[PDB]
């Protein structure tokens, strides 16, 4: 039980292909007691979370909603029992409107759309940390999901910009979280077939290039390797790593080709 008796909040489950879902699954297999947050289709999310190996309370959280953030810590402590604190927080939340992504030209995305995407994808990592650090134990771990944005690439467009912002936000969260003995890190995943992927020739070349570049290969169908990596960061086995990015991408980013 890598996470034996750790209390861990996990956001961002929308389907059972969600990366968050597999993080939640692997964490429970490893003895973690979870609290879960879900955004919009709460009834649907409850049905999806029923398929996890264990029961976990489900709280409503719209990261754009200031009231939800203000009430979050109180709602969490109620669910885990007063006197108890969190050892773990997982941010697995991303969004960018269609105008900011894919076939749509980079220059045509209006700021309102980009701003919303940045709000949800980058700024929310800080506001979740603000809301939850007060109910976190020393030795604890905050973890967010990243996609390496250090080089530009077709299609990913303004979401790349959002991820660049996130990485920077992560380094500042690490400063604040350090005052509580809490670590903050990001996991940079290779591409994964999720619901979000749903929203062409260049993206396929990027994927296949992925497996080819990855010295141990990469399998877009399998979220388990990134779930494990996130669990490794939630654990006590990376105690001197903070403000940082761990690459769970088959090693692809270390190879030019």
Author numbering: 3 to 201, 212 to 269
Give the original sentences from the paper that presented this experimental model.
Compound screening against purified M. tuberculosis InhA identified three initial hits, AN2918 (6-aryloxy-benzoxaborole), AN3438 (5-aryloxy-benzoxaborole), and AN6534 (7-aryloxy-N-sulfonyldiazaborine), which had inhibitory concentration (IC50) values against the enzyme of 44, 12, and 79 μM, respectively. AN2918 was not active (IC90 > 200 μM). AN2918 (6-aryloxybenzoxaborole) had activity against InhA that did not translate to M. tuberculosis activity, whereas a close analog without the para-CF3 group was inactive against the enzyme and M. tuberculosis (data not shown), whereas AN3438 (5-aryloxybenzoxaborole) was active against both the enzyme and M. tuberculosis. To understand the binding mechanism of these boron-containing inhibitors, co-crystal structures of AN2918 and AN3438 with InhA were solved to 2.5 and 2.55 Å, respectively.
The frontline antitubercular drug isoniazid (INH) targets the mycobacterial enoyl-ACP reductase, InhA. Inhibition of InhA by INH–NAD results in impaired synthesis of mycolic acids. Here, we report the identification of the diazaborines as a new class of direct InhA inhibitors.
